[PDB]
Short mmCIF file of C-alpha atoms and ligand atoms in Angstrom, two decimals:
data_model
loop_
_atom_site.label_atom_id
_atom_site.label_comp_id
_atom_site.label_asym_id
_atom_site.label_seq_id
_atom_site.Cartn_x
_atom_site.Cartn_y
_atom_site.Cartn_z
CA UNK A 1 -72.21 323.49 182.93
CA UNK A 2 -73.15 323.74 179.16
CA UNK A 3 -76.45 325.04 177.73
CA UNK A 4 -79.10 322.37 176.93
CA UNK A 5 -80.62 323.17 173.48
CA UNK A 6 -83.79 321.58 172.19
CA UNK A 7 -83.39 320.03 168.73
CA UNK A 8 -86.00 322.67 167.25
CA UNK A 9 -83.76 325.63 168.40
CA UNK A 10 -80.69 324.28 166.48
CA UNK A 11 -82.91 323.38 163.58
CA UNK A 12 -83.97 327.06 163.08
CA UNK A 13 -80.62 328.73 163.80
CA UNK A 14 -78.96 326.50 161.13
CA UNK A 15 -81.77 327.49 158.61
CA UNK A 16 -83.39 323.92 158.88
CA UNK A 17 -79.84 322.24 158.67
CA UNK A 18 -79.20 323.81 155.25
CA UNK A 19 -76.87 321.13 153.76
CA UNK A 20 -75.64 323.61 150.93
CA UNK A 21 -72.12 325.07 151.46
CA UNK A 22 -71.59 328.63 153.01
CA UNK A 23 -70.23 329.72 149.53
CA UNK A 24 -73.73 329.01 147.89
CA UNK A 25 -75.62 330.68 150.73
CA UNK A 26 -76.20 327.56 152.82
CA UNK A 27 -75.13 326.55 156.35
CA UNK A 28 -72.93 323.57 155.70
CA UNK A 29 -69.20 324.18 156.81
CA UNK A 30 -68.11 320.56 156.25
CA UNK A 31 -68.38 316.95 157.28
CA UNK A 32 -66.43 314.29 159.14
CA UNK A 33 -66.91 310.44 159.78
CA UNK A 34 -69.09 311.16 162.80
CA UNK A 35 -71.25 314.10 161.50
CA UNK A 36 -72.00 317.32 159.49
CA UNK A 37 -70.86 320.76 160.72
CA UNK A 38 -73.28 323.75 160.34
CA UNK A 39 -72.92 327.48 160.95
CA UNK A 40 -75.56 328.83 163.29
CA UNK A 41 -76.57 332.15 164.76
CA UNK A 42 -77.86 332.34 168.41
CA UNK A 43 -78.69 335.71 169.79
CA UNK A 44 -76.27 337.78 167.57
CA UNK A 45 -73.50 335.04 168.35
CA UNK A 46 -72.05 332.76 165.57
CA UNK A 47 -71.84 329.11 166.46
CA UNK A 48 -70.69 325.87 165.05
CA UNK A 49 -73.34 323.02 165.25
CA UNK A 50 -72.20 319.43 164.76
CA UNK A 51 -75.15 317.16 164.06
CA UNK A 52 -73.92 313.63 164.78
CA UNK A 53 -74.58 310.96 162.11
CA UNK A 54 -71.67 307.65 168.19
CA UNK A 55 -73.26 308.26 171.66
CA UNK A 56 -70.03 307.39 173.47
CA UNK A 57 -68.10 309.98 171.44
CA UNK A 58 -70.97 312.47 172.29
CA UNK A 59 -70.57 311.71 176.07
CA UNK A 60 -66.69 311.58 175.88
CA UNK A 61 -66.60 315.05 174.16
CA UNK A 62 -68.95 316.56 176.88
CA UNK A 63 -66.94 314.83 179.74
CA UNK A 64 -63.43 316.11 178.46
CA UNK A 65 -64.79 319.59 177.61
CA UNK A 66 -66.32 319.99 181.14
CA UNK A 67 -62.92 319.09 182.72
CA UNK A 68 -60.56 320.82 180.23
CA UNK A 69 -61.01 324.63 179.50
CA UNK A 70 -57.89 326.50 178.04
CA UNK A 71 -57.01 329.39 175.64
CA UNK A 72 -55.71 326.73 173.13
CA UNK A 73 -58.69 324.36 173.33
CA UNK A 74 -61.92 324.87 171.41
CA UNK A 75 -64.85 325.71 173.79
CA UNK A 76 -68.15 323.73 173.94
CA UNK A 77 -71.15 325.99 174.43
CA UNK A 78 -73.86 323.43 174.62
CA UNK A 79 -75.63 320.33 173.22
CA UNK A 80 -78.89 318.77 172.13
CA UNK A 81 -80.00 315.13 172.98
CA UNK A 82 -83.89 315.48 173.12
CA UNK A 83 -84.36 314.13 169.59
CA UNK A 84 -83.16 311.01 167.88
CA UNK A 85 -80.35 313.24 166.71
CA UNK A 86 -77.39 314.35 168.85
CA UNK A 87 -75.89 317.89 168.49
CA UNK A 88 -72.77 319.65 169.85
CA UNK A 89 -72.58 323.43 169.80
CA UNK A 90 -69.22 325.11 169.87
CA UNK A 91 -67.62 328.61 169.78
CA UNK A 92 -67.23 329.45 166.08
CA UNK A 93 -63.65 329.52 164.73
CA UNK A 94 -63.74 332.09 161.84
CA UNK A 95 -60.45 330.87 160.32
CA UNK A 96 -61.33 327.19 160.14
CA UNK A 97 -58.71 324.56 160.49
CA UNK A 98 -54.82 324.68 160.15
CA UNK A 99 -55.16 322.03 157.37
CA UNK A 100 -57.45 324.30 155.29
CA UNK A 101 -55.21 327.42 155.81
CA UNK A 102 -52.05 325.44 154.91
CA UNK A 103 -53.77 324.44 151.66
CA UNK A 104 -55.20 327.99 150.92
CA UNK A 105 -58.71 326.49 150.72
CA UNK A 106 -61.42 328.92 149.35
CA UNK A 107 -58.83 331.57 148.23
CA UNK A 108 -57.36 332.33 151.65
CA UNK A 109 -53.83 333.92 151.47
CA UNK A 110 -50.82 331.70 152.58
CA UNK A 111 -49.90 331.81 156.26
CA UNK A 112 -46.68 333.65 156.91
CA UNK A 113 -43.76 331.98 158.88
CA UNK A 114 -44.47 334.43 161.77
CA UNK A 115 -48.17 333.23 162.00
CA UNK A 116 -47.07 329.53 161.58
CA UNK A 117 -44.66 329.91 164.63
CA UNK A 118 -47.46 331.34 166.82
CA UNK A 119 -49.88 328.50 165.78
CA UNK A 120 -47.26 325.81 166.53
CA UNK A 121 -46.64 327.41 170.01
CA UNK A 122 -50.44 327.75 170.71
CA UNK A 123 -51.06 324.05 169.60
CA UNK A 124 -48.25 322.90 171.96
CA UNK A 125 -49.75 324.91 174.83
CA UNK A 126 -53.12 323.13 174.15
CA UNK A 127 -51.57 319.66 174.23
CA UNK A 128 -49.62 320.58 177.37
CA UNK A 129 -52.87 321.43 179.17
CA UNK A 130 -54.40 318.10 178.07
CA UNK A 131 -51.44 316.09 179.34
CA UNK A 132 -51.23 318.00 182.64
CA UNK A 133 -54.97 317.08 183.05
CA UNK A 134 -53.98 313.41 182.35
CA UNK A 135 -55.80 313.23 178.97
CA UNK A 136 -54.48 311.77 175.81
CA UNK A 137 -56.00 313.35 172.61
CA UNK A 138 -55.46 310.26 170.24
CA UNK A 139 -56.14 312.20 167.11
CA UNK A 140 -53.69 315.19 166.92
CA UNK A 141 -53.63 316.45 163.23
CA UNK A 142 -53.89 319.83 161.38
CA UNK A 143 -57.68 319.12 160.68
CA UNK A 144 -58.15 319.11 164.49
CA UNK A 145 -56.19 322.38 165.01
CA UNK A 146 -58.74 325.35 164.76
CA UNK A 147 -58.00 329.05 164.25
CA UNK A 148 -60.00 331.92 165.93
CA UNK A 149 -60.43 335.59 164.90
CA UNK A 150 -56.79 336.27 165.92
CA UNK A 151 -55.38 333.00 164.34
CA UNK A 152 -54.99 331.50 167.99
CA UNK A 153 -54.55 327.70 167.73
CA UNK A 154 -57.42 325.76 169.27
CA UNK A 155 -57.17 321.87 169.64
CA UNK A 156 -60.52 320.23 168.76
CA UNK A 157 -62.35 316.88 168.64
CA UNK A 158 -62.14 315.19 171.99
CA UNK A 159 -64.52 312.33 171.01
CA UNK A 160 -61.51 309.80 171.00
CA UNK A 161 -59.78 311.31 174.06
CA UNK A 162 -58.69 309.05 177.00
CA UNK A 163 -58.32 309.79 180.72
CA UNK A 164 -52.30 300.75 178.21
CA UNK A 165 -53.64 298.62 175.34
CA UNK A 166 -56.85 298.69 173.23
CA UNK A 167 -58.58 296.28 170.88
CA UNK A 168 -60.16 299.15 168.84
CA UNK A 169 -57.35 301.07 167.05
CA UNK A 170 -58.56 304.60 166.27
CA UNK A 171 -56.96 307.78 164.69
CA UNK A 172 -55.54 309.05 161.40
CA UNK A 173 -52.99 306.58 159.85
CA UNK A 174 -50.78 309.39 158.39
CA UNK A 175 -50.28 311.09 161.76
CA UNK A 176 -50.23 307.96 164.04
CA UNK A 177 -47.15 306.74 165.99
CA UNK A 178 -46.00 303.09 165.28
CA UNK A 179 -47.23 301.89 168.69
CA UNK A 180 -50.56 303.65 168.29
CA UNK A 181 -51.09 301.59 165.06
CA UNK A 182 -50.23 298.46 167.31
CA UNK A 183 -52.91 299.33 169.87
CA UNK A 184 -51.04 301.23 172.56
CA UNK A 185 -52.51 304.24 174.30
CA UNK A 186 -49.83 306.64 175.53
CA UNK A 187 -49.41 310.46 175.67
CA UNK A 188 -46.11 309.98 173.74
CA UNK A 189 -48.19 308.94 170.62
CA UNK A 190 -49.73 312.68 170.71
CA UNK A 191 -46.11 313.90 170.64
CA UNK A 192 -45.40 311.85 167.44
CA UNK A 193 -48.55 313.21 165.81
CA UNK A 194 -47.62 316.75 166.80
CA UNK A 195 -44.32 316.12 164.98
CA UNK A 196 -46.16 315.36 161.69
CA UNK A 197 -48.23 318.58 162.18
CA UNK A 198 -44.90 320.54 162.58
CA UNK A 199 -43.74 319.09 159.16
CA UNK A 200 -47.07 320.20 157.54
CA UNK A 201 -46.42 323.80 159.05
CA UNK A 202 -42.87 323.82 157.51
CA UNK A 203 -43.80 322.28 154.13
CA UNK A 204 -47.34 323.31 153.47
CA UNK A 205 -47.85 319.61 152.39
CA UNK A 206 -50.61 317.30 153.64
CA UNK A 207 -49.50 314.35 155.78
CA UNK A 208 -50.73 311.89 153.13
CA UNK A 209 -51.01 312.40 149.29
CA UNK A 210 -51.61 309.32 147.18
CA UNK A 211 -50.50 311.09 143.95
CA UNK A 212 -47.14 312.06 145.63
CA UNK A 213 -43.67 310.48 146.11
CA UNK A 214 -43.33 309.82 148.98
CA UNK A 215 -47.04 309.43 149.85
CA UNK A 216 -46.39 309.99 153.62
CA UNK A 217 -44.93 313.22 154.91
CA UNK A 218 -43.05 311.63 157.91
CA UNK A 219 -40.87 309.82 155.32
CA UNK A 220 -39.22 313.13 154.36
CA UNK A 221 -37.40 312.80 157.88
CA UNK A 222 -35.64 309.68 156.38
CA UNK A 223 -34.61 311.55 153.19
CA UNK A 224 -33.16 314.34 155.14
CA UNK A 225 -31.21 312.08 157.56
CA UNK A 226 -29.91 309.91 154.67
CA UNK A 227 -28.64 313.29 153.06
CA UNK A 228 -30.82 312.59 149.96
CA UNK A 229 -32.54 316.10 150.63
CA UNK A 230 -32.52 319.01 153.11
CA UNK A 231 -35.25 320.74 155.06
CA UNK A 232 -34.51 323.79 152.78
CA UNK A 233 -35.74 321.80 149.80
CA UNK A 234 -39.08 321.11 151.56
CA UNK A 235 -39.78 324.72 153.03
CA UNK A 236 -43.21 325.90 151.76
CA UNK A 237 -42.58 328.22 148.73
CA UNK A 238 -45.80 329.98 149.59
CA UNK A 239 -43.94 332.01 152.30
CA UNK A 240 -41.61 335.00 151.89
CA UNK A 241 -40.61 335.51 155.56
CA UNK A 242 -39.11 332.07 156.54
CA UNK A 243 -35.55 332.29 157.94
CA UNK A 244 -33.23 329.22 157.79
CA UNK A 245 -32.42 329.32 161.59
CA UNK A 246 -36.04 329.19 162.88
CA UNK A 247 -37.08 326.73 160.29
CA UNK A 248 -34.19 324.36 161.27
CA UNK A 249 -35.13 324.96 164.95
CA UNK A 250 -38.79 323.90 164.22
CA UNK A 251 -37.53 320.91 162.11
CA UNK A 252 -35.17 319.81 165.05
CA UNK A 253 -38.37 319.69 167.37
CA UNK A 254 -40.37 317.73 164.70
CA UNK A 255 -37.40 315.29 164.23
CA UNK A 256 -37.30 314.66 168.10
CA UNK A 257 -41.11 314.21 168.14
CA UNK A 258 -40.89 311.64 165.27
CA UNK A 259 -38.47 309.17 167.06
CA UNK A 260 -39.73 305.61 166.42
CA UNK A 261 -38.93 304.62 170.07
CA UNK A 262 -41.67 306.38 172.22
CA UNK A 263 -39.29 306.84 175.29
CA UNK A 264 -36.72 308.84 173.14
CA UNK A 265 -39.43 311.38 172.19
CA UNK A 266 -39.44 314.64 174.30
CA UNK A 267 -42.43 315.21 176.72
CA UNK A 268 -44.91 318.11 175.72
CA UNK A 269 -43.21 320.51 178.28
CA UNK A 270 -39.81 320.10 176.44
CA UNK A 271 -41.62 320.59 173.08
CA UNK A 272 -43.28 323.83 174.43
CA UNK A 273 -39.77 324.99 175.76
CA UNK A 274 -38.01 324.28 172.33
CA UNK A 275 -40.77 326.13 170.43
CA UNK A 276 -40.45 329.31 172.68
CA UNK A 277 -36.57 329.23 172.28
CA UNK A 278 -37.16 329.12 168.41
CA UNK A 279 -38.79 332.65 168.51
C1 6QY B 1 -63.28 320.84 156.27
N1 6QY B 1 -63.23 322.26 156.72
C2 6QY B 1 -63.79 323.18 155.66
C3 6QY B 1 -63.83 322.55 158.00
C4 6QY B 1 -64.94 321.72 158.54
C5 6QY B 1 -65.65 322.38 159.75
C6 6QY B 1 -64.60 322.65 160.90
N2 6QY B 1 -65.18 323.07 162.14
C7 6QY B 1 -65.21 324.26 162.80
N3 6QY B 1 -65.23 325.41 162.07
C8 6QY B 1 -65.50 326.46 162.76
N4 6QY B 1 -65.75 326.65 164.05
C9 6QY B 1 -65.75 325.52 164.79
N5 6QY B 1 -65.88 325.39 166.15
C10 6QY B 1 -65.88 324.07 166.47
C11 6QY B 1 -65.65 323.27 165.36
C12 6QY B 1 -65.48 321.80 165.30
C13 6QY B 1 -65.17 321.25 166.64
C14 6QY B 1 -65.20 319.75 166.49
O1 6QY B 1 -66.29 319.03 165.90
C15 6QY B 1 -66.47 319.64 164.61
C16 6QY B 1 -66.63 321.10 164.63
C17 6QY B 1 -65.55 324.28 164.20
C18 6QY B 1 -63.53 323.68 160.31
C19 6QY B 1 -62.82 322.93 159.11
#
């Protein structure tokens, strides 16, 4: 199904796991809580190699990736398990994550409103495919939305995905639904998290900022509803092509996604429908 790489092959293609960043001539692209991401080159093809630093998340990623293949899901090419180290090889996303592009990391120009609308639609198509295949992502966030050579949105990181209550609460607190913080596992929690992503797209602001008032982005929904502020006051100033009608239409979707009561949230098919009507 996927290519079985030996640890020595991934060792050489990543220039002996060169921990220096890409900008300084190394191979390190970044790091997460479960491992370091390296740029690799296998037979004239660029790859992303995640060296895990745990086995259940390796197995779950492979299991979900074998079952779910879609235009808006990142593709797994292979893996390595022969050593004491576990590696996952993916299709390389030249435009990194949506979080990095919204923050203009490493001098990248701001995303236009037109590109932002296409990204939101693509991400919704990806979540829709996961839910149609009875999978809950559990960690929907802008850092988990990757961008290819045409800025096509690709949902990533299926290590926490589930095919209901849990004793092990996992995810990113700033994006998590109230019931998800309580231990509930439901596809409606993915909808809430997508609502936070839509707010990041409109504002260009991260979900959480400790040196900001309010610290959490989902709290701007309260300020707008209580008439303290408007969505117009929060529109990313780094755009020149945003129109009030489509911004209000995306905000309306985000607002519906961010309902505290999980049953009042729209399903992903409705979210997909509202985002298509927006354009
Ligand atoms: C913090 N920031 C600079 C970045 C950290 C690296 C990250 N990863 C990717 N970048 C490019 N192509 C990729 N294909 C697959 C991946 C993911 C898939 C899930 O596991 C982790 C790697 C990937 C992009 C954002």
